[PDB]
Design a protein around this ligand. Structure first.
Ligand SMILES: COC1=C(OC)C(=O)C(C/C=C(/C)CC/C=C(/C)CC/C=C(/C)CC/C=C(\C)CC/C=C(\C)CC/C=C(\C)CC/C=C(/C)CC/C=C(/C)CC/C=C(/C)CCC=C(C)C)=C(C)C1=O
Ligand SMILES: NC(=O)C1=CN([C@@H]2O[C@H](COP(=O)(O)OP(=O)(O)OC[C@H]3O[C@@H](n4cnc5c(N)ncnc54)[C@H](OP(=O)(O)O)[C@@H]3O)[C@@H](O)[C@H]2O)C=CC1
Ligand SMILES: [Zn+2]
Lengths: 86, 115, 342, 208, 96, 230, 125
């Protein structure tokens, strides 16, 4: 019913992860300041695709593609999952 | 391209034709096999086993592999017809003394370490 | 489980199943199949024998090296039973004679010997005991064979409260007297049946089914103090059963009714043979007695066994009884017999 | 160098080299390589399509006359794209000589049967088919020769296990001999004997 | 140096005896258990230590080519004796 | 302590700049399972156990003696899974025999973050089984069957959680020291007066540290040799 | 005459291997490590393919080591990793490949043993 964790799999040097990288360069810090108890696991990705993961109660998960997303799109998606929407 | 030399068939259509011919020959042979070897199976069981052996290899898409499979099946048919084979050889297809090995996770976990 | 008795391998000939079984009566019809099924999995099998060792030779290839141990025993001796059950976690009892010998009556083989085995194996710390009685065991049955079976069943239950008791009914197989007895009658000319076999119902069971049921009951943790009845999937009138037997053997079937007293006199006449009798009075009583129905007892399907119909395995027993003319006839050519099911 | 070392023969070496050159010049369509081993053993590598011409020329030519086929076998080398190496050994009685002809194939490519050239090949080609799975085209009666009836796979192939996949035993319940998955009381013990120091400098390979 | 286990089974030079709950003992009932009675560790412990007037001694087990490969044993340590690694014989220099 | 060390690293970084890929900051681990656990989202430490004393406890090879039955409520169900009888075994209700590192193909992540996989040398003794297979069978019995049935499927799930756990022998990583330094500057927990003293003060302590080494007679001989001259 | 077959090579149905030993097996393709007890490197030149280790148990008689794995002894030798991969692929075995590990070139200098001011100077020789 509620958020338990977030996983952001970004790829270290692929163009399609570039915007996501910018997010972590600038907007990850204050997002962690706002959510001191939410585990936002930042992990490295292989040549496939950037992704975001959301875990809910009783182990329910689904992922969102972040390929070619700009930093604003990334934070919009993150606030959408962080809010009671979608 | 891929520059291969055939055995008998140039495409899958001829290979399928040969498969059908071999299947016809096995189907005709089964009742004689049951009579000669004095097998305790029915003709229905024998034809079902022939179909099962044919369907084991239904996924093959290479005409050369199909040609070799038909050659092996023809070798087995020739062997059966001439009585080179004994009743033990025919009955080896049915695995009558083999205890059923389970396929679900829990039973495998119980019996041992092999997956 | 005593590390040496932890199962290992793929359940084959060179594997370790964790079973150490002493099989009394392993030199008979059921014993060879039981020992074969135990040695298939890689079990340690201890065979007590009183016969000539030549008669045990056929049991030698049933196990790996060292997996079958042969030991002499005496049914009237309890030190010998102690000697042969000292190291086993399973004891199976298959001791029994259809006819009564001078040194052993029915009460000796069906009461005294089973009770002595149960007492000694309980004393020795044997974990499991499997006893075989009959489906038609009864305290007031006309056959002394079945009366002794019921008495011995009670004695075993008293001496080994956690024993599994199995009650089969007319096992048929390659070396089975029941299938053979009907086949044997053709030499005389006519088949003598009491009331023409129209007042008897039989539910015969396959030998491999009974062996598999015993093996599964060993491996079943909840089958400890249970009582099972092993019966086939079909019930036949005796007349139809014998007619089917004669049709599978391709022999001319000439049934005639014989009165009960005449058949008893014939059985008594055959009883005086110093060798194995062709028939006895007890056999005549047991042949023309209907198989009991015991729906309250667990069956082969509770042990995971799907009963084999006689229509599928009759030819493998009766092809030997054919002449050269009909020796190659197929199995599905004989038109299965009529079943009186419910 | 005298007592324990095998002596050389340069005359036979020269004769075999000249005859190998002869054979290569006469049949350029098929001959890919010619070798003379240090102990005087002539070898001629060819193309598979030339199995029948080459052998025919070798057995019929007046200057060849290799009318006898010693033996015919195959070698499995899994690292090669063409797995199987087909080796023919021929003897000439007129010239008291021997010659080896080698060609290649893989699992799915047939080789021309040479029963027409040599009658002796029949069983040799059947044996190669049985042990290695190499099909021979236009073979009179091609079937297993060495293995058991209904035996699956080819034993001589490098991938095949030494003890196979099935064993046999007599089963009393079915009253016959049955085939079951192999179980071994004692596993064959694999030894690692190869020395970590090089033995023969003359055969050293380039370091890639 | 034979000795029986609490089960009455002889213990071998190796020291292996079947445990009380081990079913495998059934293989000896109505038969016997093969045990070699001449324990080599005890027999070699009875041989007298050879005293030699040199720092380095040689041993080949006796019999020349019928013994073991010839080895050389240093005898400088006086707290112990030089023991052959093949035969087990002991050597020392005259001490005290 | 971590905040102070990160402050030292930050001062170096701002004074000298970043030369490129140097990564001044480093953490030296001593436990084989720690880095993978942290990569999986496991919470480091046993503090949450003391904060919320559980009724059902899963000891997965945990023999450190950190949590005993004095730190738990009564009638607590303790399940121990492992290969050795150590601190964690005799205090459990159910014991599940697992496989040691020599008896499975399993993944371990070292101090560098490099992921490596062991291979089966021998099979587990007796009735012992592979650890993830124990967990999967237990999940099936309880009705919530886990999606993976084989080792490749469980490693696909591993990749789903943390993708770096399937890139054997890869050690490349991204530097996020600036963000971590910012996040560390928030709290200002006070430093203790106690002098920094390592657990392995001397050579004798080095030998017997884990359950495998505590059961080793060779390590006992080594300890006896370093304590007693002889 | 050529027929232009288009599909990937696949010979599993012709090899006669039981399907259990085709689908549940994992092969390892690797250059074996040098035995640390010796300095020779001649056993680190070729690629090896070997199967996964299966269960071994104790024979009740004699206590020998028993197996039910028919591929427990099979080792294949290849010139290059590509050949090993092609063989495993055409035989239908799942494989794990490991890149060849070579010792890095080291700068040796005997005179460094006697450095005037360096730490490399030997305290004994
Ligand atoms: C499988 O078990 C069994 C056996 O084992 C092998 C038997 O032999 C057996 C009895 C075996 C019979 C064949 C014995 C019958 C004796 C002969 C057939 C001769 C019978 C006919 C006369 C005695 C000869 C003269 C004819 C008169 C009418 C005058 C039975 C019943 C049996 O059941
Ligand atoms: N239709 C059937 O066969 C079914 C059988 N019954 C029961 O199932 C059990 C097995 O039947 P089955 O195999 O057909 O019978 P068998 O006659 O074929 O074998 C009986 C076994 O018991 C041994 N035995 C018999 N008497 C003695 C004795 N006085 N002392 C020592 N050993 C003896 C025999 O040894 P030896 O050869 O040396 O004499 C023999 O191994 C029996 O208890 C039987 O009563 C259950 C329902 C019917
Ligand atoms: Zn010596």
């Amino acid at each position: 019913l509620g958020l338990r964790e977030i996983r952001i799999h970004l790829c270290q040097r692929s163009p399609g992860s570039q915007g996501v990288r910018d997010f972590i360069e600038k907007r990850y810090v204050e997002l962690k300041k706002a959510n001191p108890d939410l585990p936002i696991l930042i992990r490295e990705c292989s040549d496939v695709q950037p992704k975001l993961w959301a875990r809910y109660a009783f182990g329910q998960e689904k992922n969102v593609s972040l390929n070619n997303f700009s930093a604003d799109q990334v934070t919009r998606t993150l606030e959408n999952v962080l809010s009671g929407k979608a | 391209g891929t520059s291969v030399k055939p055995i008998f068939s140039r495409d899958m259509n001829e290979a399928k034709r040969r498969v059908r011919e071999l299947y016809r020959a096995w189907y005709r042979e089964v009742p004689n096999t049951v009579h000669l070897f004095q097998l305790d199976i029915s003709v229905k069981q024998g034809r079902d086993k022939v179909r099962e052996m044919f369907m084991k290899n239904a996924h093959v898409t290479d005409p050369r592999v199909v040609d070799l499979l038909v050659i092996k099946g023809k070798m087995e048919l020739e062997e059966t017809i001439n009585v080179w084979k004994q009743r033990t050889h025919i009955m080896r297809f049915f695995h009558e003394t083999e205890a059923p090995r389970p396929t679900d996770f829990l039973s495998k976990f119980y019996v041992g370490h092999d997956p | 489980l005593h590390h040496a008795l932890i199962p290992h391998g793929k359940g084959g000939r060179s594997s370790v199943s964790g079973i150490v079984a002493t099989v009394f009566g392993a030199t008979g019809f059921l014993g060879r199949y039981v020992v074969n099924h135990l040695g298939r999995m890689g079990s340690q099998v201890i065979v007590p024998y009183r016969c000539e060792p030549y008669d045990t030779m056929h049991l030698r290839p049933m196990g790996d090296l060292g997996q079958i141990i042969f030991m002499e025993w005496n049914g009237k001796d309890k030190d010998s039973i102690r000697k042969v059950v000292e190291h086993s976690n399973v004891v199976i009892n298959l001791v029994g004679r259809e006819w009564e010998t001078k040194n052993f009556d029915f009460e000796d083989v069906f009461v005294k010997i089973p009770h002595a085995i149960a007492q000694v194996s309980k004393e020795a710390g044997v974990e499991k005991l499997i006893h075989i009685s009959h489906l038609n065991a009864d305290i007031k049955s006309p056959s002394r064979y079945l009366r002794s079976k019921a008495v011995g069943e009670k004695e075993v239950r008293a001496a080994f409260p956690e024993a599994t008791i199995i009650k089969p009914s007319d096992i048929f197989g390659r070396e089975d007297r029941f299938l053979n007895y009907f086949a044997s009658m053709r030499w005389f000319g006519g088949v003598p049946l009491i009331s023409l076999g129209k007042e008897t119902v039989k539910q015969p069971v396959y030998i491999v089914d009974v062996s598999k049921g015993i093996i599964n009951a060993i491996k079943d943790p909840d089958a400890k103090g249970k009582t099972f009845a092993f019966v086939g999937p079909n019930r036949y009138l005796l007349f139809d059963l014998v007619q089917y037997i004669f049709a599978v053997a391709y022999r001319p079937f000439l049934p005639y009714p014989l009165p009960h007293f005449a058949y008893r006199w014939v059985g008594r006449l055959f009883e005086v043979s110093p060798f194995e009798p062709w028939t006895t009075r007890d056999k005549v009583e047991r042949v023309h007695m209907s198989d009991m129905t015991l729906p309250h007892l667990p069956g082969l399907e509770d042990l995971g066994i799907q009963a084999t119909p006689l229509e599928l395995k009759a030819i493998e027993v009766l092809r030997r009884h054919r002449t050269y003319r009909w020796l190659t006839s197929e199995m599905e050519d004989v038109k299965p017999a009529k079943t009186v099911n419910i | 160098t005298r007592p324990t070392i095998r002596p050389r023969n340069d005359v036979v070496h020269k004769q075999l080299s000249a005859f190998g050159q002869y054979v290569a010049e006469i049949l350029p369509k098929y001959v890919q390589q010619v070798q003379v081993s240090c102990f005087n053993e002539l070898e001629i590598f060819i193309h598979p399509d030339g199995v029948i011409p080459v052998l025919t020329f070798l057995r019929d030519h007046t200057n060849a006359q290799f009318k006898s086929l010693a033996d015919l076998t195959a070698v499995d080398v899994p690292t090669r794209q063409n797995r199987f190496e087909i080796v023919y050994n021929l003897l000439s009685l007129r010239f008291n000589s021997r010659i080896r002809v080698k060609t290649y194939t893989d699992e799915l490519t047939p080789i021309e049967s040479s029963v027409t050239v040599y009658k002796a090949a029949n069983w040799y080609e059947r044996e190669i088919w049985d042990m290695f799975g190499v099909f021979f085209a236009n073979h009179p009666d091609l079937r297993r020769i060495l293995t058991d009836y209904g035996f699956e796979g080819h034993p001589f192939r490098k991938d095949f296990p030494l003890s196979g996949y099935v064993e046999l035993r007599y089963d009393d319940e079915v009253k016959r001999v049955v085939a079951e998955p192999v179980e071994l009381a004692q596993e064959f013990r694999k030894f690692d004997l190869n020395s970590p120091w090089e033995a023969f400098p003359a055969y050293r390979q380039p370091p890639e | 140096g034979v000795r029986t286990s609490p089960t009455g089974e002889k213990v071998t030079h190796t020291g292996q005896a079947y445990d009380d709950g081990d079913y495998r003992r059934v293989r000896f009932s109505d038969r016997q258990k093969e045990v070699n009675e001449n324990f080599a560790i005890d027999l070699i412990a009875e041989q007298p230590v050879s005293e030699v007037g040199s720092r380095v001694i040689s041993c080949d087990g006796g019999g020349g080519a019928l013994g073991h490969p010839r080895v050389y044993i240093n005898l400088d340590k006086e707290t112990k004796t030089g023991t052959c690694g093949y035969c087990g014989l002991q050597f020392r220099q005259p001490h005290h | 302590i971590l905040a102070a060390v990160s402050n030292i690293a930050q001062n170096i970084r701002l004074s000298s700049g970043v030369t490129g890929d140097w990564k001044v900051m480093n953490i030296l681990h001593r436990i084989a399972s720690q880095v993978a656990a942290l990569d999986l989202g496991y919470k480091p430490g046993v503090e949450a156990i003391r904060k919320n004393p559980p009724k059902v406890l899963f000891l997965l090879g945990a023999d450190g003696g950190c949590i005993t039955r004095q730190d738990l409520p009564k009638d607590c169900f303790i399940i121990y899974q492992g290969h050795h009888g150590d601190v964690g075994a005799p205090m459990a209700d159910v014991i599940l025999p697992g496989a040691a590192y020599t008896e499975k193909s399993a993944t371990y992540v070292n101090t560098e973050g490099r992921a490596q996989q062991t291979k089966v040398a021998v099979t587990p003794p007796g009735l012992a089984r592979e650890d993830w297979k124990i967990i999967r069978a237990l999940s099936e019995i309880a009705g919530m069957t886990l999606p993976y049935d084989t080792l490749d499927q469980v490693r696909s799930r591993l990749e789903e959680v943390s993708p770096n756990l399937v890139r054997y022998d890869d050690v490349e990583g991204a530097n996020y020291f600036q963000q971590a330094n910012e996040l560390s500057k928030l709290v200002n927990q006070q430093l203790l007066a106690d002098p920094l003293v390592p657990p392995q003060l001397t050579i004798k302590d080095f030998y017997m540290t884990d359950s495998i080494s505590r059961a080793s007679q060779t390590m006992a001989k080594c300890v006896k040799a370093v304590t007693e001259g002889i | 005459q050529l027929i232009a077959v288009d599909e990937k090579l696949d010979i599993t149905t012709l090899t006669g291997v039981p399907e259990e030993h085709i689908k549940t097996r994992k092969v390892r393709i690797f250059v074996p490590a040098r035995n640390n007890m010796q300095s020779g490197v001649n056993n680190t030149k070729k690629w090896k393919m070997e199967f996964d280790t299966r269960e071994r148990w104790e024979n009740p008689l004699m206590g020998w080591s028993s197996t039910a794995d028919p591929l427990s002894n099979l080792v294949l030798t290849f010139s290059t990793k590509e050949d090993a991969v092609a063989f495993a692929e055409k035989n239908g075995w799942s494989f794990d490949v490991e890149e060849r590990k070579v010792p890095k070139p080291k700068s040796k200098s005997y005179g460094a043993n006697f450095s005037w001011n360096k730490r490399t100077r030997v305290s004994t020789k």
